[PDB]
């Protein structure tokens, strides 16, 4: 069951995998939830995405200390928007090694974000260049193409049925594709489908702005995105 911890919510999804959820009261929209992941890999913890703020991200680290009590070896963040990278300073203050798409790091200052310490680069087929993601353990990083943003990346978790679409994917009942301000409308549908094709065995799709869903999240997202082009 959901665990309320301060102003955040944590949900166990699998052995060794939890979803973190944080909220930003954005004037004109409401209080917007954003989800990321926490993965235990043996004697260390790996984080996917910050919370919206430094204070909230420090609370994620406090929850990890309380509930897992192992060091956080690294974090990977999935594009240069506040819901995914707003808490980078808190990660750095904690001594955690941070990673983002090279393009996210390039974009970070202009987006009002602090860059990660390390840049991921990607092969033409979308898989991360392995030398740029050292010690990622079960995290399998894939660039599906431009969609929600030009820089959006995705993460599969080996040893589980889980793949994380970040803000690219919406659930199977969503009425819209959410924040398209920085979107690539031409390529969105193909990028959503490429995410699915990269992680064909994933039966639980985790995403930023919906609760976990089946692979119908991918097909529905792509079908909605067909209407953008
Ligand atoms: O976002
Ligand atoms: Zn975004
Ligand atoms: Zn988002």
From Swiss-Prot:
Activity control mechanisms: Inhibits by captopril, thiorphan, dimercaprol and tiopronin. This enzyme is not susceptible to inactivation by the beta-lactamase-blocking agents clavulanic acid.
Cofactors, names only: Zn(2+)
Molecular functions (GO terms): beta-lactamase activity; zinc ion binding
Catalysis performed (reactions): a beta-lactam + H2O = a substituted beta-amino acid
BP terms from Gene Ontology: antibiotic catabolic process; response to antibiotic
Comment on bound cofactor: Binds 2 Zn(2+) ions per subunit.
Gene Ontology, cellular component aspect: periplasmic space
Residues noted as binding Zn(2+) 1 in the record, renumbered to the chain: 79, 81, 148
The organism's place on the tree of life at top rank: Bacteria
Keywords: Antibiotic resistance, Hydrolase, Metal-binding, Periplasm, Plasmid, Signal, Zinc
Entry binding sites for Zn(2+) 2: 83, 167, 209
EC number(s) stated in the UniProt entry for this protein: 3.5.2.6
Binding site for substrate: 170, 179
Cell compartment(s), UniProt: Periplasm
Function: Confers resistance to the different beta-lactams antibiotics (penicillin, cephalosporin and carbapenem) via the hydrolysis of the beta-lactam ring. Does not confer resistance to the polymixin colistin or the fluoroquinolone ciprofloxacin.
Assembly and binders: Monomer.
Family statement drawn from the similarity comment of this UniProt entry: Belongs to the metallo-beta-lactamase superfamily. Class-B beta-lactamase family.
UniProt miscellaneous comment: Enterobacteriaceae carrying this gene (identified by PCR) have been isolated in Sweden, India, Pakistan, Bangladesh, England, Scotland, Northern Ireland, Australia and the USA. The organisms they were identified in were K.pneumoniae, Enterobacter cloacae, E.coli, Proteus spp, Citrobacter freundii, Morganella morganii, Providencia spp and Klebsille oxytoca. In India most isolates were from community-acquired infections rather than hospital-acquired infections, indicating the gene is widespread in the environment.
Protein name: Metallo-beta-lactamase type 2
Organism for this UniProt entry: Klebsiella pneumoniae
Lineage of the species this protein comes from: Bacteria, Pseudomonadati, Pseudomonadota, Gammaproteobacteria, Enterobacterales
Gene name, Swiss-Prot/TrEMBL: blaNDM-1
Residue window of the full protein shown: 42 to 270 of 270
